[PDB]
Structure formats: C-alpha cells, structure tokens
Symmetry: C3
Subunit: 204 residues, 3 copies
C-alpha cells in the first residue's frame, strides 16, 4: 500500500492553518506503509527525515549520473576534447553541480590557453585506473559560451612538460576551467592548477 | 496530463504488500505522460531514475542558489564582512551544504584570528572575474555562534602580506573557517590555508 | 491546508498537452497555501523554485547525515578502522556522495598500502576539535570490495612519520582512497595525499 496524506502541523482555530504533505509506501515484505517523504509546512523536503531543517534533507546518499572521463588537449597535434555535454546543454544548465567517480582527466593547452604561469604548457595526463577518483563539475559561462569548473583527485597521473617529458607520476589533483572556444570549434583549458605527488603546478 | 499512481512492487498474497508512488507528467509537445519521479518501496527517491539505489537519485544536475561573493577582512582598517546569511540563519541550518559559482572571497585577520602559523596576517584578495570559481560552504557552529567552512578555487587571486605587499597573483584556492564573533559584532576568519599559484599559505 | 494540483504548462488543442504537478502547503500561522514543490513537464524538480532549470533545483541548503569521524590505521600495533558503513552497504550504494562536518580522520598504512611514494608510512593524525571540517565521501569499488574516496580539510592535524615523530601540526587536508581488504578483515588506506600547513605529503 502507498498513500499521500495532508496533515495539520499546528492547532487550527480558523478553518485554515499549517499543514504538510506526507508520502507513505510499504517496504517489500512489509504489511504496513511507513512515511518516506515529507513536504513540510515551511516547504522543506525531508527524505527519510520527518522534521527536516534543510530545504532538501536527505537521510542517505545522493547519486548523479556517471559522466565518464573528461579530456581537453590542445598541443602540436591539434585540438581534441571529450566532453559529455554540448555547449548548448551547459549554457542551458548554469549553476548545476555534478559529482561522480571515474578515471582522471587529460588536460593541456600548450598553444595559447595554459602556456603561461609557472608551469606553462604542462599536461595533466591521467592514467585510467580501477581506483579513479571523484570529479566535481559545475556549469558556468564566459558570457557567450559554455564553461565548466572541474575538480578531480586520484590515481594515477603523469605530469608531463610541453615536450612530453614526464616530470612526475603518482597521485594527482587538478582544478581546471574549460570553455567551448568557437575559434577552434572545441573545448579548451583556460587555466588550471593542482599537484602531482608533492609537486604543485600552475598554468594559465 | 499529469497523474500520481500507486504501484505494487512485488506479488501481494495478503491484501498488503510492497508498493511505490510514481509521478507522471507530459512533456510540452507530447501527448502521453511519462514517469518523472518515484518514491520507491524502500523510500529511495528517483528523479528520472526508475529503480533508484540512492536515497536521492538524480538523473541530471543539482542546482542551489547563487550566494554571491563572500568576504571577511579584519585589519588595521577595522572589521568588515559580506556574508549572505545571518548568524541566526546559519545556526538554524546546521550541516547544510551550498555550492555555486562566483567571484572569489576576500579573507584576512591580521589583528588576532589568522595572524599565527607560517603566513600570519596574509590577505587572500580575490579579484572578481567573469571566470570566478566554485564555492562550497557548509554550516557549522562554535557551540554558541554560527560558523562556516568555506572552500573556493579559481581566477584571479592576489596574495598580500599584512602590509599590503603583493606576494603573488594568479590562480587561488582557499579553505577557510569563519565564525560570527560577538566581541567584534561580525564574521571573522579563524583559520585558513590554500595556495596562490604554486605557493602554499597557512594561517591560524 | 495542503493540496496537489495538476497544471497545464502550455495551450492544449488536442485534449492532451504539457502539464506539471505542484505541491502546496500552508506555512504555520498562514491561512493560504503556497506552492512548495513542482515536478515540471520536463521532469525537473523545483523545491522553492517555480520554473526549475536543473533536474533537482533546490532554493536552499542540502543536508545529509552526520557520519562521524572516519579512521583507518594499519601500523605495528595492528589493523584498526572506524567506518560508519559496512562493506556490503558501500557496494550496494555505488556512486553516492556524502558531505558532513566532523573531526578529521586518522589515516595510515605503514605496513604495505601507504608506505611508498615521497612520504611512505606517515600518519594523518587529526585531533578532534569543535571546529572540525567538512568530509566528502563517495562510494566506489575495487571490483570486488567496497572502496571510498574521502576528502577532509580542517583543524587540527598532526602529521607524524612512521616512527611516531610529529613532523608538523596545524591545518590539515587529505584526499585518501580506502578499501575493505579481506586479507586483513578491515578497511585500509590504499593511497592518500594532502598537506599539513604548507607541507605537502604523498603516499601510496
């Protein structure tokens, strides 16, 4: 059995007063329904929480889609990128965060965008492993085209210079900002910084 | 057309058994409704997910409000802060996380709070840019007053010493803990650490 | 008063057309109900948002459970761990993120797992404080057993070598990957990296 109940949340002297919506379902194998969600009188939503204090109060974990491995490499070989959203989608979905686990990103712009600062032209060259690491991607804009702010940490990453020489290899972390650049018909790294093992790197 | 259906999730030999709530809406331009949300028999909520494994299982992005630029500067000039929540609101909303994109924070306490550790009295002096960066703010408490744990990374940040001398400028990241201090009638930085380019800084 | 309304989201020439579900509740002390949640025609859920652009669009904060302090220490003394989930639970809840505030983790493997790389065998030895810091834990897998990717930053952390000698103490940040290792009947640190004050550490 499942049901939706409207429940008073205070005494009602006038016919009208505070009220909430509760959503009840019966667990498999059970015979009685139990309250699973509430939209409270204050608009707070409780999921497994009866008196939510947060606007979205979740008594458990939060899951989003696995968007795979992200890459954006501009070098002597040309412009490439693997990005699981279009420019138009990112622009339509401003401010949205996405977190998932996957192999690390491959990131470089040794032509223009990330060839200034202390470590001009480096490649954050993640080796995909079973361990991988968490991505965090939030959608933003240059004002005309889609941009993303991307974070990832995990195993294993090779930091290479613009000549391809491995400078270090091990654990890697990066914060990077990418944008869709119409002048090269693809996503590019505008700036990024992070670390491989104990070595910080920065380019812009 | 929109509708709410109560659906059995297993065979029912006794009149009672497992059941879920499904919420159907019709996309604009469509003629048939499609299932958009489920509150499952186990209480898991699926949003675009039919058999959610997570308590809140979202087939897309998650958005929260844009809370703007955050600042808390105590120096020779006095005590200032720009904080988009009151002390009372933070105390009423413990444990809540907030993520958004905006210009970086401006942070310093060269009088007391962040004038110890390796980089006593520095200012994390973010220049607001179109790129900005992601904030993460989670609400906490000293036990009496509101505290926040704040993270931000992005472009562009000037690291200054307590005398105003620019030590470095470029990409910046900070983790900082701020609290509402009644002794100065405002928010202050209790401790923070991060980096500008490849230079780590730490104060407490 | 509380209510659930099915509302057209466009003109309907044929009997069928786009529609949304709105959920209305009355705030305590109020006499009229106000719209608190919408499941839109496109399946986007707005919580305090009338025309959500995100699949889960929340006009406020997001809260999850406080899972306490996490530890996993393997050294000369043996194998210990404090982990608020079982192996089976983590494996059933892949891809789920969890964020909360608590005292920092205690992490080391000086026998095998984290006794390579630049800082073999170190202990990230968090001292629990009232300030604490934010955890982020996302669930993953080795392919057979539960793994977690864990992040924490905050006050106060002692970085110790494998001999117990305090190398540094102050603000601490860690990214660590832990997994349930049946060969020692407990969770262990596979690799981690972070910083105490301005000192980066890395082990794998």
């Amino acid at each position: 059995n499942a049901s939706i109940n409207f429940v008073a949340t205070e005494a009602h002297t006038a016919s009208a007063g505070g009220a909430k919506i509760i959503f009840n379902t019966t667990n498999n194998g059970a015979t009685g329904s139990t309250e699973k969600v509430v939209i409270d009188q204050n608009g707070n939503v409780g999921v497994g929480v009866g008196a939510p204090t947060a606007k979205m109060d979740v008594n458990g974990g939060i899951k989003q889609p696995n968007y795979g491995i992200i890459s954006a490499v501009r070098n002597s070989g040309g412009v490439t990128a693997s990005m699981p959203w279009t420019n138009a989608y990112v622009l339509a979905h401003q401010g949205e965060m996405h977190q998932w686990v996957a192999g690390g990103p491959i990131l470089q712009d040794s032509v223009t965008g990330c060839n200034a600062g202390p470590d001009a032209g480096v490649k954050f060259d993640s080796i995909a492993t079973s361990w991988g690491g968490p991505y965090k991607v939030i959608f933003h804009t240059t004002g005309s085209n889609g941009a993303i702010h991307l974070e990832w940490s995990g195993w294993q990453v090779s930091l290479k210079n613009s000549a391809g020489t491995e400078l270090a290899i091990g654990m890697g972390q990066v914060f990077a900002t990418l944008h869709y650049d119409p002048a090269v018909s693809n996503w590019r790294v505008e700036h990024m910084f992070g670390r491989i093992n104990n070595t910080n790197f920065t380019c812009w």
